Design an enzyme around this catalytic site. Structure first.
Site, mmCIF file in Angstrom:
data_model
loop_
_atom_site.group_PDB
_atom_site.id
_atom_site.type_symbol
_atom_site.label_atom_id
_atom_site.label_comp_id
_atom_site.label_asym_id
_atom_site.label_seq_id
_atom_site.Cartn_x
_atom_site.Cartn_y
_atom_site.Cartn_z
ATOM 1 N N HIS A 159 6.474 6.559 11.130
ATOM 2 C CA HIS A 159 5.966 6.368 9.789
ATOM 3 C C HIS A 159 5.416 7.767 9.450
ATOM 4 C CE1 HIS A 159 4.354 4.883 6.202
ATOM 5 N NE2 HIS A 159 3.434 4.041 6.634
ATOM 6 N N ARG A 199 0.935 -1.118 0.000
ATOM 7 C CA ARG A 199 0.000 0.000 0.000
ATOM 8 C C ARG A 199 0.990 1.184 0.000
ATOM 9 N NH1 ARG A 199 -1.541 -1.484 3.899
ATOM 10 N NH2 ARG A 199 -2.920 -3.164 3.228
ATOM 11 N N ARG A 230 11.787 1.174 3.920
ATOM 12 C CA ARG A 230 10.932 0.558 4.903
ATOM 13 C C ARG A 230 11.846 -0.492 5.467
ATOM 14 N NH1 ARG A 230 4.872 0.516 5.512
ATOM 15 N NH2 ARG A 230 4.513 -1.219 6.998
#
Ligand SMILES: [Zn+2]
Ligand SMILES: [Zn+2]
EC number: 2.1.3.2
Lengths: 153, 310, 310, 153, 310, 310
Positions: C134, C54, C105
């Protein structure tokens, strides 16, 4: 006035009426179509004789009115049923069933791989016939089946 | 706008002989002078839920020859860890917001169709779903048969292999009945043969069809020999071996081929078509797979251009 | 140069209310007329050490709407065979030489920060590291709350779910205390509730906060209902089932919603928010996830443009 | 009884009926505690008025004797229900709900990790009462939940 | 005339004050003048669908020792996980025709129970059925407490670690309340504190109980310190640090310890009990582990025979 | 003087009308007044290269019961799959020096045979060698038919399911034709209908046989309805639905059933036999499964000893 034999049911004031629901089917539509989420009177003629029909069913509801479309959809769950408009102790509107070409949200796809199982979607089986089987074509997996299948587990 | 503009390309049984003509016509017409920036400043998705790098490679390749951007994934199985309740329905609504046109492959039958009900504005294509459709594979097949036969009607189609579960032959056979004449010859094992499924409708439209056991029969009288792929895990080793020799191809049988004929295969191959065949001109499979870019370019072209001038 | 130009975007507790304003402002402002070649002739990396499509999809999507090139990987687990002594430190020095701005990430807390000490010239972003920050997810959350509420201060924030380990709520809650007023209401199970961690500082800046057990209490008095995700492998099946019903959402509860209110969810979803909700206007999650492109476009924009004119 | 007026409720023969079922629970019953799966006259007055200011549901089943135990399984769902032994319009017993030490067959264990969920057996909890909670402990996994907790979904 | 013949052993609550009291007496005898050819010609299917060496090895160790033989398995995947396959009932029925007894270990609460309803006369025992039960353990803990203090009554028991989910820890109490006069101390994090309902169980039984912050306090009077492995699993990677700082046990803490005191643990210990301990006096863990034998030994003997001349 | 001593058991055709007739007589006796220390000091290597619990568990159950002990294994991957490793011959030679008997199960037709040519005097039996053989099964089916009807002759046998590939189903017939007067009914899909060559085998033996569309017909005279699990595997995901609609068995179909009739199945059943059946009279599956024992029990005894005083 009071005569020889104490018969049974008389005509109730008004609402929808569909005459002749097959052996052990009343509940079938009553559930498959959930005709109970209605604040109106749901009297349900069950397990009672009809002429020589030892066992027949008949939903009885006040203030509601079966839509033309509703009538098409039960024509594969009750072929010889009969919808009508009941007006103050006086029926009118002979709106009996008739097999549709679409059928929505009730039947289940026997195709184990069809996506109509996981994802939240409206069940859609097209409707056609042979001469013993009413071919229900899937909206998702596009697989042809018959009514003598889809109506099972 | 164009007959086929922003029109979810999901199943061949939904496309139309005119749309088909448009598509193939575009394909070849566009095959003359490509615009390496037709869908410029645009992003296409490429959600390959089920891996498959021939159809992935080609699509992303066509995507680039059209000056578009591609974002997406080629999901395999080490991501089985995905199994958890994140539905495709949401996977698509999210994804729909990011792009212009989704390209997807999926294991369950109902993929592409189902995302349609959660993307709308974003027109989706179908790189293959379940054992249902693969509109794109029948497209490249068709356009290719045209390019070579010159015509797309009154042909001599021959289909060998696993015609029973071979989704590449059901989709082609359908789409071909959309033209006049086309003489059909089936050649599959007696338990892998075509189903009455397509059969009935084949007769229904007065489409002459036949069935044989040896290619070596329908050879002098054929135009397109579509080789499917008969699988080992589809028939027990012993029988597979038995009912195989005459469900294979070799140069030695092409000996009396109408020069006008071509040999195709949805691909890939392994036992079926022998390599000596790789030389005899009937050998068109690899070239057929090159055409796959154009039929696929045009597919998006239309799906993305309100109108096409060129 | 711009206040936030080539400034490693690593943690929200490092960003500033002005930077934040800039970011969101850029986001919306740039949301009007995009330049599909702003960071043209440029290459962005996208090192997704921990998979997540996503946040991967969106970032690479934003990357393209800005005419940039993306090179990189979406590493899963079949590459556990990587475990061998090739440190991230070297992985970054090498990688740093190839590009302009890294997007990463990682599974361990200290990712992005640590690469900073080995990239320098190459400014890195943080698509999520460990159970720390994040910045990007809180960004799209904020900008989205603005877009809808109109204002970004003096709101009625409601946060339901696993507030204890839910890193998407700690980062949002922090960043919101950067504005005046904002009435906070927490709604999580009595063993998944907010930690004194954020709590203390919440009081410290006179930020009115509260706690309840049923959304159905703080409903008539809320503006943004952020649904987190309560997990099964976070609480034993039995209890999970028990302490769940009033840690879920349904259309039937939204019955008295201040029309001005929206329902959000960092995503994805599974048990939490029911689909009937998918219709009632408060339903903004999917749209919220669309905004994620702009907050992310601007994030790079600034990080890559010495100055912004537009 | 000529006050605010309507006109329905009718008993019809020698049969044990269920009179007084809370809104939205009639049909509910019919499917949890299998009542319709029969072949003896049924008249279901779902949404029919009663002499207590409230219109509710009526499940008339002729030709059946329901054990005091069976009655108890109605409790949780339809509360102060009533099933009377009826012969020739005359009553021969007034049965009202009580809480059985055990409920059975219908309820689903909430614990996703329960062999119950993937095996050919049947739900057998246990019944306990606490101030505002009616407790139910699964005979299989041995986890005790709450009436709402189990009786929801 | 013993009570346990041809009967089942599933839950702990499914037993009695004298049931245990019989079992244990047997546990001592069999440890004194052991019966080796006790179960000759008998066969016990040790079915560990969920592999568990230590709990397995032992059970069979007993089995074999007792002149009996075994049939069975470790792990369980006839193919994959939870696909369309055989049901437990079916596995359980067939297996029950040829074996004389059934000892299974499963990861689903009530599997052992379910076997009961399908296994005929074959008495099934339970080696572990998820967070539900694990009888034999609580039995070996118990008997071992007797082997050590001489009495199950008037004990200053203490349980540290993860009481919340610790399967051995709820069950031990349940069983020790069957005895007279027992004071329970609950020294564990408030994130893993004793599961409420049990607190009631003790409140209503008029049992002496209380919670604690740091072991040091109770070390004095506690005649039993049954430790629980706080598996880093259930916690956040960092969280573990803050707590597992005192809920461990260096011999340096021991000092205060009553001379009779002993340290117990279901194993396997990783960080809970320090290595210094292993060589000290109160170290009793491994002994508890080895003593397990006789419980199971006795148990099987009390399950398989009408009468037993000891 | 028995015929089976030091001999092998591989295929069914490798046996006789009286061979079976001996084996079975033994199967009854051993069930009557069982010999427990029959095979004391003997050792049997149950080698399941292809794991198979039910077929394993039992064989060993017999073994142990008979006073014998086992050596062996489940699954088989000394490393990976089919790499440069040990050959079966070599595995088989070494193993044959230390064990007294050899019971192996393999996924390759003829493995059990191959062991024959390398295993010395050690008689090898076959637990399953691919689609080839599986003797002991057909034996337990058979003997069970005797245990039920009293006679293997004049039986109205019927076999439903997957006759085509069903390994238990070709072999049963082969063996039942060894007996006098047997009428075979073949009720199965035409996609999984009886493998031709066997139809000849019966045609030439002048055996009464025929095919069928829906069980209902033969239910009357059939004294045996041996069911076959139509593993959804071999079929298309959808196909399974159309057929497996009547080739199942609800007790509601039972009615017509002859009083002596019994339902058999090699197991494990998933969808074939309905749960209603389990509790009815004709349900005989699990019994057939449990009866297997004595066949193998007898068999091993008839393989390992010169003479047997029963
Ligand atoms: Zn479907
Ligand atoms: Zn349960």
């Amino acid at each position: 006035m009071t005569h020889d034999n104490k018969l049974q049911v008389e005509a109730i004031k008004r609402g929808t009426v569909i005459d002749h629901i097959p052996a052990q089917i009343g509940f079938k539509l009553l559930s498959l179509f959930k005709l109970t989420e209605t604040d109106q009177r749901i009297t349900i003629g069950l397990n009672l004789p009809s002429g020589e029909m030892g066992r027949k069913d008949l939903i009885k509801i006040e203030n509601t009115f079966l839509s033309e479309d509703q009538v098409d959809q039960l024509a594969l769950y009750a072929p010889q049923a009969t919808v009508n408009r009941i007006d103050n102790y006086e029926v009118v509107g002979k709106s009996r069933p008739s097999l549709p070409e679409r059928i929505d949200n009730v039947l289940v796809c026997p195709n184990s791989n069809c996506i109509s199982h996981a994802e939240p979607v409206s069940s859609s089986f097209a409707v056609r016939k042979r001469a013993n089987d009413i071919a229900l074509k899937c909206k998702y997996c596009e697989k042809e089946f018959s009514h003598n299948v889809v109506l099972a587990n | 706008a164009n007959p086929l503009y922003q029109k979810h390309i999901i199943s061949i049984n939904d496309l139309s002989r005119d749309d088909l003509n448009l598509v193939l016509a575009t394909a070849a017409k566009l095959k003359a002078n490509p615009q390496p920036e037709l869908l410029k400043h645009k992003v296409i998705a490429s959600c390959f839920f089920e891996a498959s790098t021939r159809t992935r490679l080609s699509f992303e390749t066509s995507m680039h020859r059209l000056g578009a951007s591609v974002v997406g994934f080629s999901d395999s199985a080490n991501t089985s860890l995905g199994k958890k309740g994140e539905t495709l329905a949401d996977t698509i609504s999210v994804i729909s917001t990011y792009v212009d046109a989704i390209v997807m492959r999926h294991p369950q039958e109902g993929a592409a169709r189902l995302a349609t009900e959660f993307s709308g504005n974003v027109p989706v294509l179908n790189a293959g779903d379940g054992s249902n459709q693969h509109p794109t594979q029948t497209l490249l097949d068709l356009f290719t048969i045209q390019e070579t036969q010159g015509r797309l009607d009154n042909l001599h189609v021959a289909m060998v292999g696993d015609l029973k579960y071979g989704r590449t032959v059901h989709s082609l056979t359908q789409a071909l009945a959309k033209f006049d004449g086309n003489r059909f010859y089936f050649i599959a094992p007696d338990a892998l043969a075509m189903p009455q499924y397509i059969l009935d409708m084949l007769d229904e439209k007065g489409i002459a069809w036949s069935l044989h056991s040896s290619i070596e029969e329908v050879m002098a009288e054929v135009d397109i020999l579509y080789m499917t792929r008969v699988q080992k895990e589809r028939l027990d080793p012993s029988e597979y071996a038995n009912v195989k020799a005459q469900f294979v191809l070799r140069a030695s049988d092409l000996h009396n081929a109408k020069a006008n004929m071509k040999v195709l295969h949805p691909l890939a191959r392994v036992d079926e078509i022998a390599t000596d065949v790789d030389k005899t001109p009937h050998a068109w499979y690899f070239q057929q797979a090159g055409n796959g870019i154009f039929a696929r370019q045009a597919l998006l072209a239309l799906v993305l251009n309100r109108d096409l001038v060129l």
